[PDB]
C-alpha cells in the first residue's frame, strides 16, 4: 500500500543512503 | 507557554554556572594539560601495514640491528683533509656511542674499515659520516629522548682542532622541529590576541559585550580541554599531538560560532522591541535546535573519520567527537544561563548604533530582484578560482619548511658542501633467497643486480659488497679464495646476512629524494631489481625496500584514499542533516553542491596565491586540515541560514528571503570574519606550514562568507522559487489581502 511507502520516505531514503555509503567505504578500506 | 528546558536553564542559572566552574577547576587541577598527555602517549606515524614499515622491521630482524625505523647521522668536516687525529677521535666516538645500550641499538662502521673507507669518505677528503640506529619508532617520544642523549654524548667530548661535528638525519629533524614548534608560539600568540580583541571591538563596538563573549569562549575551551585530558589520562582513549592541536583550534571555532549566534539572536530580538525575558525565550527557541544539529553532525562526521587506514587520521576521530559533544553541552547549558544572569543583573547586553541589518536588508532586496545577474557574477568569480586547481604539486621535504638556524639544518648544510648527492637520506634494498649466497655465482648475480639498479634514471650511488664505493660500472670477477681475508670477513658481516641468506644495497638519490620524482623512483628501483634476478637461480626471491622515500610514497597513497573516505562520509552526513532540518531533497542537494563548489574555489585560490605568485609549493597537511575545518564551519553556517529561511517563509518567498538575510546574514558574516582574520594572523608566523594553513583557512572563510554564502545560495533560492522546497508544496506568495 502507498500509506507505508509515502509516510516513511525520509527514513527509507536515509537508510538507502547510509547503505550505499557504507558499502562503498567498506570497499575502499581494502585498497 | 514557557517550554520546560528554557525555564529549567533560566531558574537555576547560578547553580549551573557554579557547577561548570567547579568541574573545570577539578579537571584542570587534578590532570596534566593536553599537550603533556599527548607527549607521554605519542603514537607511530607509519601504519603497521605499510610495506615500508614491514620491510624495515624485517631488515632489522635479519641483520640483528634492531626493530626500529629511526636513524641519524654524524658528519665530521674539517678545513684540511682528515688525518690520523680525526681517526682517533672517530674511533673513541664510536666506542663511546656503542657503550650505551638502551639508546643506540646498533651502529654501522664503514670509515674505520680501510676497504670501504673510500666509499664512506668525500672525494676531496674533507668529510666523513656514520649511521647510528636509535630506539623508538618515528613520532614517538622514545626516539626524541634517544637522539637528545646521542647529541649530548656527541657534545661532551672535545674534538681535535680544525674539525666540527654535527648530528643530522630524519630523527634529528623531527626532534628539533618539535622543539622549534614548542619555542615558536609566543609572538604569534601575542599578535593573535591583539587582532582578536580589535576585531571583537569592531564587531560589537563595546568592551563589556566582547568581554562576555570571550568569557563564554574561554570557559567552553577550558571545559573541553579538561574533559579530553581527563579521559585520555587514564588510557581510556588514544591521543597524539596532532589531535590536540586540531582539537584546540576546532574548539575555539565552534565555541565562538555558538557564542556569537546566541548573543546576536538575543540582541536582534531585543532590537525588535521586547523585554529582557521574552527575548531570552525567543533566542533559545530559535537557536537551540540549530546548535544541537550542527554540533551532532560535526561529531558524527569526525567520528566516521576514524574508519580510515592512516594514523594521522585514524587516531583523530574519537578525541574530536568527544570534544565536540562537550562543547555542545557547554554551549547549550552554560550559555543561556550566562546570558540570563548577565541580562537580569543590569544593563550589560544592549544593542546600540545599529547599522548592520539595514545594509543586509538592502543586499537582500538586491538579491531577490535580480538573481540572474548576481548568480552569474558569483559563478564567474568561482570559475576564476577553480581554473587554477588542476595544476597543483605537493612537497614532502620538510627541511625547507623550517627556519635555517636549526642545528640539524646546519649539519645538513655542512654535508651538502662536500657531497654531491643527498647522502643524508639513503635507502636499503634486500633480496632474500632460500640458499647460501657466499660463493662466486651468487656474487656475479649480485653484481648484475647492482648494475641494473645503478642504471635507473636519477640513481647516483649504489653501494654493494661487490663495489664498496658505489660505482659498479665495470666487468668483474670475485675468486672464491678471497673469503679467507679477515677484512673481507668484516665486509661480509657488514653486507651479507650472518646465516648467508640475504644481501643489501645502499642506494642514494640525486637532488631532493622527497620531491615527486624521488617518490616515483622507488617503484622503478623495485622493478629493476626484479628484472635483474629474472632467469637466474635467485628467481622468485623476496625484495624488501626500506627507507624514507618508500614511507612517503605509501603515505601519499593512503592519503588519497583516506581523503576520499572522509569526503564521502562528511557529504552524506551534511545531506542527511539538511534533509531532516528542512524536509526537501532539492534544498539539501543545492547546499551540498554549493559546499563542494566553495571548497574547490577556495583551495584553488590558495594555490594561486602560494604556488604561482610566491613560488613555494604547499605541504599536504595543509590540504587535510584546511578541508576538515572548512567543511565543519561551512556546515554550521549553512544549517543556521537554511533553518532561519525555513522559519519565515510563510509571508511569501521574496519577503522571507530578504528578512532571513537582514536577520542572519549579519550574524553569519560577523562570525565568519572574526574567525577568518583570527586565522589570518598566523601569516606573520615564522613556521611556513602553520602560516600556510592559517592563510588557506582565512582566505577560504573570506571567500565563503562574502561571495558563496551571501550572494550565491540566496540567489539560487530566489531563482528556483517554489521548487526549492520540493517535495513539500509551498506558495510563492500568499493570498492578496485587502488594503
Ligand atoms: C541528489 C539526490 C539524492 C537522492 C535521490 C533519491 C530521490 C528520491 C526522491 C523521493 C521522492 C519524494 C517523495 O516522498 O515523494 C513525495 C511526492 O511524490 C511525488 O509526487 C513524486 C514522485 C517521486 C518520484 C521519484 C523519482 C526520482 C527523482 C530523482 C532521481 C534520482 C536523482 C539522482 C540519483 C543519483 C545521482 C547522483 C511524497 O509526498 P509526501 O507524502 O512526502 O508529501 C507531499 C505530497 N505530494
Swiss-Prot record, chain A:
Positions of transmembrane segments: 7-26
Expression is induced as follows:
Repressed by MmpR5. Repressed by iron. Regulation is IdeR-independent.
Localisation? Cell inner membrane
Q: What phenotype has been reported when the gene encoding this protein is knocked out? A: Deletion mutant does not exhibit a low iron growth phenotype, but has attenuated virulence compared to the wild-type strain. Deletion of both mmpS4 and mmpS5 drastically decreases synthesis and secretion of siderophores, and greatly reduces virulence in mice.
Subunit relationships:
Interacts with MmpL5.
Task performed by this protein: Part of an export system, which is required for biosynthesis and secretion of siderophores. Essential for virulence. Overexpression of the system confers non-target based resistance to azoles, clofazimine and bedaquiline, via an efflux mechanism.
Similarity annotation: Belongs to the MmpS family.
- Listed name of the protein: Siderophore export accessory protein MmpS5
From Swiss-Prot, chain B:
Which keywords does the record carry? Cell inner membrane, Cell membrane, Membrane, Transmembrane, Transmembrane helix, Transport
Residue spans crossing the bilayer: 12-32, 184-204, 211-231, 236-256, 283-303, 321-341, 370-390, 560-580, 590-610, 613-633, 667-687, 710-730
Inducing stimuli: Repressed by MmpR5. Repressed by iron. Regulation is IdeR-independent.
Topology versus the membrane: Multi-pass membrane protein
Gene Ontology annotations for the cellular component aspect, listed alphabetically: cytosol; extracellular region; plasma membrane
Annotated Pfam families: MMPL
Q: Which domain of life is it from?
A: Bacteria
Where is it localised? Cell inner membrane
> Taking the first listed entry, what is the main subcellular location of this protein, grouped into a coarse class?
membrane
List the InterPro entries.
MMPL_dom, MmpL_fam, Mycobact_MmpL
- Among its keywords, does the record have Transmembrane? yes
Q: Which PANTHER family match?
A: MEMBRANE PROTEIN MJ1562-RELATED, MEMBRANE PROTEIN YDGH-RELATED
Q: Which family does it belong to?
A: Belongs to the resistance-nodulation-cell division (RND) (TC 2.A.6) family. MmpL subfamily.
Q: What does this protein do?
A: Part of an export system, which is required for biosynthesis and secretion of siderophores.
Subunit structure, per the record?
Interacts with MmpS5. Can also interact with MmpS4.
Q: What is this protein called?
A: Siderophore exporter MmpL5
Question: Native species of this protein?
Answer: Mycobacterium tuberculosis (strain ATCC 25618 / H37Rv)
Q: What is the lineage of its organism?
A: Bacteria, Bacillati, Actinomycetota, Actinomycetes, Mycobacteriales
Amino acid at each position: 500500500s502507498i500509506g507505508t511507502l509515502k509516510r516513511a520516505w525520509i527514513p527509507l531514503l536515509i537508510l538507502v543512503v547510509v547503505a550505499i555509503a557504507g558499502f562503498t567505504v567498506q570497499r575502499i578500506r581494502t585498497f | 507557554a514557557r517550554p520546560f528546558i528554557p525555564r529549567m536553564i533560566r531558574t537555576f542559572a547560578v547553580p549551573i554556572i557554579l557547577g561548570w566552574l567547579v568541574t573545570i577547576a577539578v579537571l584542570n587541577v587534578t590532570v596534566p594539560q593536553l599537550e603533556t598527555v599527548g607527549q607521554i602517549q605519542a603514537v607511530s606515524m607509519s601504519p603497521d601495514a605499510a610495506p615500508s614499515m614491514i620491510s624495515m622491521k624485517h631488515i632489522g630482524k635479519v641483520f640483528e640491528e634492531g626493530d626500529s625505523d629511526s636513524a641519524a647521522m654524524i658528519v665530521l668536516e674539517g678545513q684540511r683533509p682528515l688525518g690520523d687525529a680525526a681517526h682517533a677521535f672517530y674511533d673513541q666516538m664510536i666506542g663511546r656511542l656503542q657503550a650505551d645500550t638502551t639508546h643506540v641499538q646498533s651502529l654501522q662502521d664503514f670509515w674505520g674499515d680501510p676497504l670501504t673507507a673510500t666509499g664512506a669518505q668525500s672525494s676531496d677528503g674533507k668529510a666523513a659520516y656514520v649511521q647510528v640506529k636509535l630506539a623508538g619508532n618515528q613520532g614517538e617520544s622514545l626516539a626524541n629522548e634517544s637522539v637528545e642523549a646521542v647529541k649530548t654524548i656527541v657534545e661532551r667530548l672535545a674534538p681535535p682542532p680544525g674539525v666540527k661535528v654535527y648530528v643530522t638525519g630524519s630523527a634529528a629533524l623531527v626532534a628539533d622541529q618539535q622543539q622549534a614548534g614548542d619555542r615558536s608560539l609566543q609572538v604569534i600568540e601575542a599578535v593573535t590576541f591583539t587582532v582578536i580583541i580589535v576585531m571583537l571591538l569592531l564587531v560589537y563596538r563595546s568592551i563589556i559585550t566582547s568581554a562576555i563573549m570571550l568569557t563564554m569562549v574561554v570557559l567552553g575551551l577550558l571545559a573541553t580541554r579538561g574533559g579530553v585530558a581527563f579521559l585520555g589520562f587514564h588510557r581510556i582513549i588514544g591521543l597524539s599531538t596532532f589531535a590536540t592541536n586540531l582539537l584546540v583550534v576546532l574548539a575555539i571555532a565552534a565555541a565562538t560560532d555558538y557564542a556569537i549566534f546566541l548573543i546576536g539572536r538575543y540582541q536582534e530580538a531585543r532590537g525588535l522591541g521586547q523585554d529582557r525575558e521574552s527575548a531570552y525565550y525567543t533566542m533559545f527557541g530559535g537557536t537551540a535546535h540549530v546548535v544541537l544539529g550542527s554540533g551532532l553532525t560535526i561529531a558524527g562526521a569526525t567520528f566516521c573519520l576514524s574508519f580510515t587506514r592512516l594514523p594521522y587520521f585514524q587516531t583523530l576521530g574519537v578525541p574530536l567527537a568527544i570534544g565536540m559533544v562537550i562543547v555542545v553541552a557547554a554551549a547549550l547549558t552554560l550559555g543561556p544561563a550566562i546570558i540570563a544572569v548577565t541580562s537580569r543583573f543590569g544593563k550589560l547586553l544592549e544593542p546600540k548604533r545599529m547599522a548592520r541589518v539595514r545594509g543586509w536588508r538592502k543586499v537582500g532586496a538586491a538579491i531577490v530582484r535580480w538573481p540572474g545577474p548576481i548568480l552569474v557574477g558569483a559563478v564567474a568569480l568561482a570559475l576564476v578560482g577553480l581554473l587554477t586547481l588542476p595544476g597543483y604539486r605537493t612537497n614532502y621535504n620538510d627541511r625547507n619548511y623550517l627556519p635555517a638556524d636549526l642545528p640539524a639544518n646546519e649539519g645538513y648544510a655542512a654535508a651538502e658542501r662536500h657531497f654531491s648527492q643527498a647522502r643524508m637520506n639513503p635507502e636499503v634494498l634486500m633480496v632474500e633467497s632460500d640458499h647460501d649466497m657466499r660463493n662466486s655465482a651468487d656474487f656475479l648475480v649480485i653484481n648484475k643486480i647492482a648494475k641494473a639498479i645503478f642504471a635507473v634514471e636519477g640513481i647516483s650511488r649504489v653501494q654493494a659488497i661487490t663495489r664498496p664505493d658505489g660505482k659498479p660500472i665495470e666487468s668483474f670477477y670475485l675468486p672464491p679464495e678471497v673469503f679467507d681475508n679477515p677484512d673481507f670477513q668484516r665486509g661480509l658481516e657488514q653486507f651479507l646476512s650472518p646465516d648467508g641468506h640475504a644481501v643489501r644495497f645502499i642506494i642514494s638519490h640525486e637532488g631532493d629524494p622527497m620531491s615527486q620524482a624521488g617518490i616515483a623512483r622507488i617503484a622503478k628501483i623495485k622493478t629493476a631489481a626484479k628484472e635483474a634476478i629474472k632467469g637466474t637461480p635467485l628467481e622468485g626471491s623476496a625484495i624488501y625496500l626500506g627507507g624514507t622515500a618508500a614511507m612517503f610514497k605509501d603515505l601519499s597513497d593512503g592519503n588519497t584514499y583516506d581523503l576520499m573516505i572522509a569526503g564521502i562520509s562528511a557529504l552524506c552526513l551534511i545531506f542527511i542533516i539538511m534533509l531532516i532540518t528542512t524536509r526537501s531533497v532539492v534544498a539539501a542537494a543545492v547546499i551540498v553542491g554549493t559546499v563542494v563548489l566553495s571548497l574547490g574555489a577556495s583551495f584553488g585560490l590558495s594555490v594561486l596565491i602560494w604556488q604561482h605568485i610566491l613560488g613555494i609549493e604547499l605541504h599536504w597537511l595543509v590540504l587535510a586540515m584546511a578541508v576538515i575545518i572548512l567543511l565543519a564551519v561551512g556546515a554550521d553556517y549553512n544549517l543556521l541560514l537554511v533553518a532561519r529561511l525555513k522559519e519565515e517563509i510563510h509571508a511569501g518567498i521574496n519577503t522571507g528571503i530578504i528578512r532571513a538575510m537582514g536577520g542572519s546574514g549579519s550574524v553569519v558574516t560577523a562570525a565568519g570574519l572574526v574567525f577568518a582574520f583570527t586565522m589570518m594572523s598566523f601569516a606573520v608566523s615564522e613556521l611556513t606550514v602553520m602560516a600556510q594553513v592559517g592563510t588557506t583557512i582565512g582566505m577560504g572563510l573570506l571567500f565563503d562568507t562574502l561571495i558563496v554564502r551571501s550572494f550565491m545560495t540566496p540567489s539560487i533560492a530566489a531563482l528556483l522559487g517554489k521548487w526549492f522546497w520540493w517535495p513539500q508544496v509551498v506558495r510563492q506568495r500568499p493570498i492578496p489581502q485587502p488594503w
